[PDB]
């Protein structure tokens, strides 16, 4: 049986090395190689309440090695085998997640077990897991609070990281779908983006990342999901509804009742300046959208305004 393991090992490490030398000229971050028994013991053979979320390709899992915990990410077999154009994105994920680790707003890759077919990533255990579709970790209990300053810090902390994907390196990277599925939470509530396996009209540009970030910035503030409909056909846009609320309701329904208890001095003027930024962030004309490097500057200007 074990002859199958080393034949996985040779091919997967050959493909991984051929991708990493092409993407970084060989020099990288320390990646620690796990035996597969440690990962199968750490999550009880992927068959428990250890899984946080899921997707079409991948599944997250809470991990336990000795006195140190992790966030194991495996890849599903039978939805990738047969599609080699997905197979190279499988490795593009595990190489971008190892080059992007030396910025603070990406969750650090601590290693990679490559004994399995379609190798299995590991990451740091940010103890507040995946943000749900409206904002807030689930809880060890059941519900989160999210005061406004924490929401503003997690608002601009993603905006720094998207510009780290766009302007840091001599080449640009198109993270195609920003969603709050992809943002974890560290112990001080610092945003850590993740699972950039997509990373690639039928053409994506720089501005379609901004069109996603605008909706991701208004979903944290409103707390109502990205498919917002109350018994009116189950599908209508949140964005146009926020446009009519800005045009008629005039900044009264935009904050949730969960954050209805920040009524100190003004405290809503920066909410106005943040929702107006979210609306200008989502214009239909691509020549009239603000560039991503200015969104983080304007949110820092908003946060330092008090």
């Amino acid at each position: 049986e074990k002859d199958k393991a080393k034949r996985w090992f040779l091919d997967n490490g050959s493909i991984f090395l051929r991708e990493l030398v092409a993407d970084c000229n060989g020099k990288s971050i320390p990646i620690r190689s796990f035996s597969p028994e440690q990962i199968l013991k750490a999550t009880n053979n992927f068959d428990s309440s250890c899984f946080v979320s899921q997707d079409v390709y991948y599944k997250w899992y809470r991990g336990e090695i000795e006195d140190r915990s992790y966030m194991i990410k495996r890849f599903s077999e039978d939805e990738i085998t047969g599609k080699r154009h997905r197979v190279k994105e499988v490795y593009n994920d595990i190489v971008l997640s190892a080059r992007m680790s030396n910025h603070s707003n990406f969750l650090q890759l601590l290693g990679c077990c490559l004994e399995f077919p379609f190798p299995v990533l590991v990451f740091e255990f940010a103890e507040h897991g995946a943000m749900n579709q409206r904002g807030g970790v689930i809880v060890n209990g059941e519900e989160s609070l999210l005061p406004w300053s924490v929401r503003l810090k997690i608002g601009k902390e993603i905006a720094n990281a998207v510009t780290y994907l766009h302007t840091a390196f001599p080449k640009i990277i198109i993270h195609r779908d920003v969603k709050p599925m992809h943002v974890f939470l560290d112990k001080n509530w610092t945003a850590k983006l993740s699972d950039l396996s997509f990373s690639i009209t039928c053409f994506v540009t720089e501005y379609t990342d901004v069109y996603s970030f605008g909706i991701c910035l208004l979903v944290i503030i409103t707390g109502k999901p990205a498919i917002m409909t109350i018994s009116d056909g189950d599908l209508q846009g949140i964005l146009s509804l926020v446009r009519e609320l800005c045009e008629n309701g005039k900044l009264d329904e935009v904050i949730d009742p969960r954050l209805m208890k920040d009524i100190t001095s003004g405290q809503r003027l920066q909410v106005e300046a943040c929702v107006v930024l979210a609306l200008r962030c989502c214009k239909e004309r691509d020549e009239d959208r603000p560039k991503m490097i200015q969104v983080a500057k304007e949110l820092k200007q908003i946060e330092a305004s008090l």
Partner: protein, 816 residues
């Protein structure tokens, strides 16, 4: 290079005649007269390679005197490690000494009447530039008018080394031209191009990897990462054979958004095929008879900063310059050689006369550049000849890393270290002495001024290949090779390997990997006098612990470098009985899950380099039993007894580079924080705390006191919130370079600014992607007097800096 081989063999006889493991025996008397005749060879070996040409009857004699010193070494170093009885070794060298008299007497009919270069100790970095400002503005102004056509093409046509790429890299790399063009692409296409990594070398600065597939998906990412933006493309040194890719790309990139294309080429007859409308073709000029001597003064003196103070050589300095006709690299090669002498009128007129008579047959103009480079190669000192000779193997206009060369130069004994000068510092003044003759130009630097990569000019390597092929040190297309190397994917050749073979390097062009087989990989261990087995970037078919089982056959290794090899887990089990092995470089091999415990045993090595080996459980315990090594990187000390601790590092008096990889708090034991205090020769530590869990790791880093005389440090991650309380100008006065990479560091302690009347003496500083710093800017300049550069990269909340946008893009802040 027969002087360059005899100078190596004379020191290998110095260090074995004085070793006194053999006091008085049979083959020692016949070795002292061998060195006494080779010392009498060297009074007339320099003019021998000056006269290899024009006399084949001298050429065969010098070729046999060269080839017999290799048989001298292969019986010297086999008798160094023996300490037995081998009667079949004296009477061989009896012949190979007695046959050297018919290898000198026919040479002494034909003539009939050390290795320390003391002009290598200051490095100069000669890249000045003169006489281009009008000719740089008048093709700035074409690129500011790029919208007036649908697509613009710049065609530069000149002779070899006329100054085309320099006027390219002063317009491609200008500020107000960078504001106009959003993206800009610098690609080098030559006769070895393969027509795909042209597109991948373009796309490497445009976003994504090129999977091996059809040309349409290759063009789709180029079209969507350049969709109507104002780009710039420089394709360099275009050759007309298999030119037809230029029309497969020119009908694919979009017109009508500005931008321009810069195509540099030599021959005139291809500029019409460039179809560039000749008024916008640009032929650069030969230098004037005043600017040429200005460049000659700027190179050749470089200590009075370009001023002829001694007037007795001004006439000869003008008279040499007016022979090489104002063509730039001839006068700069001659000036780089004249930097090395500088004083005596006789020594100036001698090489003026040799430059005059060596040039007298051209009937050409590229024979002028290949005559002056031959002059610069001949008049070079001895052991640097082999140093540029081993650079021939690197492919067409490649980017050559520095340690790849320097750990080779210490491999084959091309280096010299005798009297306390360390072997890693003497390995690189032999590089800075090649950057002074302008035979090697430096491309990449750091903040601290050290050098990472390197390349040479294209006309130089034709000389180096031509002088190598005649002397059988290169030309892998064939058999006779002293030192071989395999480039990208030459397993289809399956080159026959034999007993000469003093080295194998692997040369890849920054992104490619030469995959290999189990066929020829076993053939390396069939060699018996190999020195440098430098297999870098590699995909094999078997694990290396099965491939390299036969290193029992090898004994004369000087260096392994298994870096970035995939299929390895263990170093092979028969590395137990290697003896010499001066270097074990194995960095970035990120799943070798144990370091094999035989490296306690050999007391010879100098470099143990294991940066970022992400899975390696600590360095077996006897690492303090090798008092010679100097570069110890990627340490990872032990927990309790599963390896070695930092108390073991206290013995190594000879080290100067060090790299720790502290990951848990229990790695540092409390009673031995005293360790890094008496290393008198240390120069650069680096502390890489990437994985870091405990809170005691912060309280056990901060008690480490680096030595009194540390020249450089750097902190990679360091999860602590504040400064470690030994970053104070009291406890490390002579610190001159400092860099802090990513992490969680928030503010600096009050002893960091150190506001007594004492200060830092830091001349360089880097603050890359921290996210939580808060320090002022005037507090820096009051606390740190003579900073020169501050490269902050991605660090917000430092907006007091004069860097343009300090939180979202790098800057430099050169001092006024």
């Amino acid at each position: 290079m027969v002087d360059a081989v005899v100078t190596v063999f004379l020191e290998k006889t110095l260090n074995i005649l004085e070793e006194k493991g053999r006091t008085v025996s049979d083959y020692r008397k016949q070795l002292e007269d061998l060195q006494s005749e080779l010392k009498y060879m060297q009074s007339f070996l320099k003019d021998a390679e000056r006269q290899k040409r024009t006399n084949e009857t001298l050429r065969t004699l010098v070729a046999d005197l060269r080839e017999l010193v290799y048989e001298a070494e292969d019986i010297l170093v086999d008798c160094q490690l023996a300490d037995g009885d081998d009667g079949n070794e004296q009477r061989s060298s009896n012949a190979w000494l007695s046959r050297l008299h018919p290898a000198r007497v026919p040479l002494q009919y034909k003539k009939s009447k050390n290795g320390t270069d003391r002009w290598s100790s200051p490095v100069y970095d000669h890249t000045q530039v003169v006489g281009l400002e009008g000719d740089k503005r008048k093709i700035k102004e074409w690129l500011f008018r790029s919208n007036d056509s649908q697509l613009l093409i710049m065609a530069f046509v000149g002779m070899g080394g006329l100054g085309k790429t320099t006027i390219a890299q002063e317009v491609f790399n200008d500020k107000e031209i960078e504001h106009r063009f959003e993206r800009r692409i610098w690609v080098s296409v030559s006769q070895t191009f393969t027509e795909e990594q042209i597109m991948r070398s373009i796309l490497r600065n445009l976003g994504d990897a090129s999977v091996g597939d059809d040309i349409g998906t290759l063009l789709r990412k180029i079209q969507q990462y350049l969709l109507g933006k104002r780009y710039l493309i420089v394709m360099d040194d275009v050759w007309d054979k298999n030119l037809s890719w230029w029309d497969k790309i020119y009908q694919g990139l979009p017109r009508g958004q500005g931008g321009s294309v810069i195509v540099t080429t030599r021959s005139e007859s291809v500029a019409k095929r460039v179809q560039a409308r000749d008024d916008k073709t640009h032929r650069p000029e030969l230098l004037s008879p005043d600017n040429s001597w200005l460049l000659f003064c700027n190179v050749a003196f470089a200590a009075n900063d370009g001023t002829c103070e001694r007037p007795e050589l001004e006439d000869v300095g003008k008279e040499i310059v007016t022979k090489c006709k104002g063509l730039p690299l001839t006068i700069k090669a001659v000036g780089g050689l004249l930097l090395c002498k500088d004083h005596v009128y006789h020594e100036w007129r001698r090489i003026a006369e040799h430059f005059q008579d060596e040039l007298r047959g051209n009937t050409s103009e590229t024979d002028n550049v290949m005559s002056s480079l031959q002059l610069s190669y001949d008049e070079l000192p001895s052991h640097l000849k082999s140093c540029i000779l081993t650079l021939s193997l690197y492919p067409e206009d490649c980017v050559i890393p520095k340690q790849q060369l320097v750990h080779g130069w210490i491999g084959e004994g091309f280096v010299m270290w005798r009297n306390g000068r360390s072997a890693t510092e003497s390995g690189e003044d032999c590089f800075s002495g090649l950057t002074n003759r302008c035979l090697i130009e430096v491309v990449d630097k750091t903040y601290s001024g050290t050098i990472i990569t390197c390349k040479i000019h294209d006309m130089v390597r034709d000389l180096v290949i031509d002088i190598a092929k005649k002397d059988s040190f290169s030309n892998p297309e064939g058999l006779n090779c002293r030192h071989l190397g395999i480039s990208g994917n030459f397993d289809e050749k399956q080159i026959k390997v034999n007993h000469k073979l003093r080295g194998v390097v692997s040369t890849t062009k920054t992104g490619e990997v030469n995959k290999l087989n189990s066929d020829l990989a076993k053939k390396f261990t069939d060699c018996k006098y190999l020195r440098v087995l430098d297999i870098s970037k590699s995909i094999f078919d078997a694990p290396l612990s099965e491939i390299l089982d036969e290193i029992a056959s090898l004994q004369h290794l000087a260096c392994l470098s298994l870096s970035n090899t995939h299929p390895l887990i263990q170093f092979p089990r028969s590395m137990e009985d290697l003896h010499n092995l001066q270097i074990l470089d194995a960095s970035y091999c990120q799943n070798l899950k144990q370091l094999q415990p035989c490296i306690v045993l050999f007391k010879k090595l100098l470099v143990l380099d294991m940066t970022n080996c992400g899975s390696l459980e600590c360095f077996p315990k006897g690492i303090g039993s090798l008092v010679k090594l100097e570069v110890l990187l990627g340490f990872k000390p032990a927990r309790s007894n599963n390896g070695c601790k930092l108390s073991e590092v206290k013995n190594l008096t000879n080290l100067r580079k060090l790299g720790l990889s502290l990951t848990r708090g229990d790695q540092i034991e409390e009673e031995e924080l005293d360790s890094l205090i008496n290393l008198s020769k240390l120069m650069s530590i680096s502390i890489n705390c990437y994985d870091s869990y405990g809170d005691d790791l912060i309280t056990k880093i901060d008690a480490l006191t680096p030595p009194h005389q540390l020249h450089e440090l750097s902190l990679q991650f360091y999860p602590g919130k504040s400064s470690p309380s030994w970053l104070s100008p009291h406890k490390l006065p002579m610190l001159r370079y400092m860099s802090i990479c990513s992490g969680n560091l928030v503010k600096m302690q009050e002893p960091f600014w150190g506001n007594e009347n004492t200060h830092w003496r830091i001349e360089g500083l880097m603050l890359s992607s921290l996210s939580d710093l808060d320090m002022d800017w005037e507090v820096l300049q009051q606390s740190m007097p003579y900073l020169r550069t501050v490269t902050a990269n991605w660090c917000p909340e430092l907006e007091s800096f004069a860097i343009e946008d300090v939180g979202f893009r790098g800057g430099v802040w050169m001092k006024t």
